Design a protein around this nucleic acid. Sequence first.
RNA 1: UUAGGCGGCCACAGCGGUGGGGUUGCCUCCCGUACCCAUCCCGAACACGGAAGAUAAGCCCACCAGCGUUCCGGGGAGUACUGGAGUGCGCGAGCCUCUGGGAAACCCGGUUCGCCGCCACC
RNA 2: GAAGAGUGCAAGAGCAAAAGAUAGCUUGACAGUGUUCUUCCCAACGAGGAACGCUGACGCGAAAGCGUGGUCUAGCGAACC
Lengths: 160, 95, 140, 154, 186
Amino acid sequence: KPASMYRDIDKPAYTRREYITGIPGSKIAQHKMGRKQKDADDYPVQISLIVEETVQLRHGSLEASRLSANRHLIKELGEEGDYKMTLRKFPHQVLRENKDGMRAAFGKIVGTAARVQAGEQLFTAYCNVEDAEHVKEAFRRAYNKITPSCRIDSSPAGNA
Amino acid sequence: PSSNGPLEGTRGKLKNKPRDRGTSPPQRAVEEFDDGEKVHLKIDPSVPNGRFHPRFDGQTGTVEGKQGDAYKVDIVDGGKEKTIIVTAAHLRRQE
Amino acid sequence: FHEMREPRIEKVVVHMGIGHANAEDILGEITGQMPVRTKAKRTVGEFDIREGDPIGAKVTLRDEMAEEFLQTALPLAELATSQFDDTGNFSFGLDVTVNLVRPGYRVAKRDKASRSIPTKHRLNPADAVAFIESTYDVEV
Amino acid sequence: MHALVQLRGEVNMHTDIQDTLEMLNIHHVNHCTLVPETDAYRGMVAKVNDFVAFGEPSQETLETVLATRAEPLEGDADVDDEWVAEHTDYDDISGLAFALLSEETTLREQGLSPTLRLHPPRGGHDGVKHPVKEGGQLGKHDTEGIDDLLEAMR
Amino acid sequence: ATGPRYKVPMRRRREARTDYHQRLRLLKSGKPRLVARKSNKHVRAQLVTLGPNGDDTLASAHSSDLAEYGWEAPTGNMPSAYLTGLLAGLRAQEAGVEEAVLDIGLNSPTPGSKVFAIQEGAIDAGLDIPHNDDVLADWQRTRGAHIAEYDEQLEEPLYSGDFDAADLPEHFDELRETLLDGDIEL
RNA sequence: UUAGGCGGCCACAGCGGUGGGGUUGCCUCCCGUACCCAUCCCGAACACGGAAGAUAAGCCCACCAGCGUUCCGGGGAGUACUGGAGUGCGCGAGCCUCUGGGAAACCCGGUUCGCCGCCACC
RNA sequence: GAAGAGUGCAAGAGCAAAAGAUAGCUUGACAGUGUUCUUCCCAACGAGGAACGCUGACGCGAAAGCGUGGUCUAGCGAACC
Ligand SMILES: [Cl-]
Ligand SMILES: [Cl-]
Ligand SMILES: [Mg+2]
Ligand SMILES: [Mg+2]
Ligand SMILES: [Mg+2]
Ligand SMILES: [Mg+2]
Ligand SMILES: [Mg+2]
Ligand SMILES: [Mg+2]
Ligand SMILES: [Mg+2]
Ligand code: NA
Ligand code: NA
Ligand code: NA
Ligand code: NA
Ligand code: NA
Ligand code: NA
């Protein structure tokens, strides 16, 4: 189904798992990528992907964009390259669907989504000055698979 | 409201803040008031008896005599006058 | 200072944890005074569903009764290092327990203005071994 | 002491906002009034803020408006120096005007109507959809600003 | 103590000095309390009323200032107790106080105790106090008879600091009569 | 209050810690069961009787801020949110200007190791 | 070790020298008649319900005092016969 059905924040927070049963599992394989044993401060450059509009991103989109970005970093740096990316959001809002007409219309559980306010960083990668152009490209592919417009922002890096 | 009992929607107003938990000081439970006196109505979560209907919480009546140890306090609900039976444990002097 | 700091025996609790009693007869003849029944709480698979019911007996000895008894009990056991409480007590064995502490103890056992004994003025594992070993036997 | 002038109509105005205007003695568009600067009075004009124009007028301007638009509690009658002299605790319009600004007396106390019914602003005003800061005519004005408006509604 | 959400008891509860549940029930009468308190060596009796900033004591007596009228014996006993109650009871009648309710604090209502002796004294002093006759010790033990019979089993003199040998319940009688006089300084 | 009793507010009073103080005075520990009374077993406790001893406990006094709590400064922040108004912007979800209010987390620095009433007493 | 236990049953709330546990005693889960609030916010409306009194008779306690059922909010029914 289309994201047009769930992209806006137009419903109350629905995250209490103590009253919601049958919630589908998340498609997000991993949140901590690269070299998780190493530290974030052990890198010269740090670039985050900033969301420009306040929206809702379904776990399907998080997996697709996280996948297509890290897949690039693995292709250009290797399965054990020097870097570490971070998907700093987890899908908490549960989604319904009215799948009778408008009689007894409360929907059944169909998925999960992460709410991101405009200005927040969805992803944050850490790499050396050399790999700085690869992380940018990996993010270019990432903002192509999520609803909002995005700003690729280099936080600690004056080696431009 | 899904129901219509007296304790409906009273979770907040009839619950003690953690640090005020436990039995309350006898001083205010034995207080004495005079007729014509202005008093504030507020239930003490810790005291079970001498209570009034929760809707009246927050009022400011006028003492007009007593019925036993309890007091008879006059108030105006909206535009209708009412007489409330209440103990000092749930009362405070105005001003 | 030392006099109001020297160790003493508060009580000696002689108890027999059975499980259903007919053992009271001997526990009284070994100490000198009357015994007390022992009930329980919570259901048990070992056919112990009845909450309040006889299981064991005990006798709390104070003063002379305590020392006189110990003048036979202690010789029957072998004291060890680990066999001591953090507060300076010890149990061995039929079981026999001995509670020790210093002079100003009534402060925590009375009713009015009662107070818990400060960590400093409390007996220690070492202070216990000393006092007791200093009474008809050996330590570790 | 500030001068209040109603610039926006009543239709679609909040009931409680309109009742404040009535308490301050103004019942029609273009009607003016003089108010002492007190905690209580200050609350009332803040609520009316988006439908009025206010500020402290100069001694002169007030004199002109009083000369031209002031009226007795009843009847037409021109309020001039002679009139002021024969009915007020003053000698001329100026004495009255000074006492007002200093909040020593009121128009009622002197037997004058609390309201100055003005004429529309010659050359038109700056619009009633924006405040003074945004180029409009609503809200708090300057002494120069308030004089400009009042002199135009001469 | 542990954190923000933690509950710390009222001060007089931490101090193990005030039974608030009994205190309230006591205050419900509307009458002034007769505070009966003892010590290892002494006894005390106060007449307390309620006040805006804390209790107001209107009258009192101590077993120490008992001697001030004739005492020359111990003060942590039965005779001492009764007499201290009567004394306090009389000073009370003088302040315009007419009735009271016995407040025994954290003591036990054991039949024939000193708090009851204190209570009997105040009743004898002319105060209207709710009581029960068959809970007060028998007249002789109040006088100090039980103690005379104890020293009757002499062998080794009971009282160290000489007041006598066999002790004197008669001294008690002398003291009672001395207080019942109307002139006496109160 | 050179050590006491009854309290109000009920952690600014909690947690933890250092130092000081008592011969016929005070409070304790303390000593002891003939009595009143007591332990489903124990004068442990409760209760009664009493001073040979002690200031080591408690208690009272002075004091330390590590944790917890109260308030305050500066910073966060006039930020987040918001009551009134707009032919202001945006495809739209939404934003912005004017007017009146105004936060929490957190960091840094002070504060707080109780205040007050009645009675008795060297 | 201030409360996470327990307190009959939903959920939310109350309770620690107790409203919990144990033990012992007791039948106030008593009769009669009201004031008030609720039912029905404001604002009229029955049954039912609750708080708080009075008269009468009792239980327990040294006594203040507590007991008008169960810590509080569900467990209810007109006329005619
Ligand atoms: Cl009510
Ligand atoms: Cl006492
Ligand atoms: Mg709410
Ligand atoms: Mg006219
Ligand atoms: Mg024109
Ligand atoms: Mg125009
Ligand atoms: Mg010391
Ligand atoms: Mg009840
Ligand atoms: Mg029919
Ligand atoms: Na259907
Ligand atoms: Na996009
Ligand atoms: Na409380
Ligand atoms: Na039994
Ligand atoms: Na101490
Ligand atoms: Na009814």
